[PDB]
Amino acid sequence: PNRFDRDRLFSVVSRGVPEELTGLLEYLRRTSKYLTDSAYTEGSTGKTCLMKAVLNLQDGVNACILPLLQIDRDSGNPQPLVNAQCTDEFYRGHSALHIAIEKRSLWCVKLLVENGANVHIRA
């Protein structure tokens, strides 16, 4: 449960159960790596774990987001995976804010803006 991979982390965030997120801090401070590294994001487009988590919600709820954001801000690159945006030609500049705004939801927007974001960022 120490070494984390993109696939298992994506599966964990997809289910929306945050109990098994204990270990991200240890891996980040042991390997000296952030959550914005290429290892945890798709290497073809730029999608990150935040994207998968916000794309899938149970009746509009996703509890795992709060541990995800808090651990990211506790340990991460100056951008806490909120200014990170898709790089693929199809969706250059496309950020998590647009993804959240698509589903016609507010609470995710509130959490994203509260934790900090660049609303002027354009896709």
Method by which the coordinates were obtained: cryo-EM
Handedness of CA 84, 21, 34, 117 (dihedral sign): positive
